[PDB]
């Protein structure tokens, strides 16, 4: 589980979206594993919007941060799940790190603010869904 709060937005991982966060869709995109809502209290986070490729995620299956280098978003093919059918999830980054499917929501942070949430993993590794990308968080 996990969210990000910035401005009068909730970004979520779709699959987790809550009755709530679909009662006030803002936007959500099956293909990212997105979902933002609108909120009325202001959020406590801001958006890197930068090309890092290294900075450090929330691991609650460790409740523990871990450093990581993570690949540029990209199309890479995801597996079926109780959420999704077998599919190319579009704007993931992938890192050698720790992760079970409660990690998700896991914040991923570099020196310029938030970068994305876990999305994906297993045997070593991680996946971030990018939010860098999605200018129109910020006004
Ligand atoms: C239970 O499946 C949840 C989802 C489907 C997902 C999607 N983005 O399509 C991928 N999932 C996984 O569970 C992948 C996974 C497997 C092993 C370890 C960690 C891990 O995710 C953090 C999210
Ligand atoms: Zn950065």
Same mark, same amino acid.
């Given at each position: ?8 937005? =909730? ?5 987790? $979206? ?7 869709? @803002?936007?959500?995109?099956?293909? =990212? ?8 209290? !202001? ?9 890092? !490729?290294?900075?450090? %995620?929330?691991?609650? *299956?460790?409740?523990?941060? %871990? /450093?990581?280098?993570? &690949?540029? /978003? &990209?199309?890479?093919? @995801?597996?079926? &799940?109780? %959420? %999704? /059918? $077998?599919?190319? !999830? *579009?704007? +993931?980054? +992938?890192? @050698?790190?720790?992760?079970? /499917?409660?990690? #998700?929501?896991?914040?991923? =942070? #570099? !020196? ?16 971030? $869904?990018?939010? =860098?990308?999605? +200018?129109?968080?910020?006004?």
């Amino acid at each position: 589980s996990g969210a990000i709060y910035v401005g009068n937005y =909730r970004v979520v991982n779709r699959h987790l $979206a809550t009755h709530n966060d679909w009662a006030n869709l @803002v936007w959500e995109d099956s293909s =990212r594993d997105l979902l933002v809502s609108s909120t009325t209290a !202001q959020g406590c986070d801001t958006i890197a919007r930068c090309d890092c !490729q290294t900075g450090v %995620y929330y691991c609650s *299956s460790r409740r523990k941060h %871990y /450093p990581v280098s993570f &690949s540029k /978003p &990209s199309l890479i093919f @995801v597996e079926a &799940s109780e %959420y %999704y /059918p $077998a599919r190319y !999830q *579009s704007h +993931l980054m +992938l890192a @050698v790190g720790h992760s079970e /499917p409660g990690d #998700c929501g896991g914040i991923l =942070r #570099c !020196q310029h603010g938030v970068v994305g949430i876990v999305s994906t993993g297993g045997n070593g590794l991680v996946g971030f $869904a990018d939010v =860098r990308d999605l +200018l129109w968080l910020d006004e």
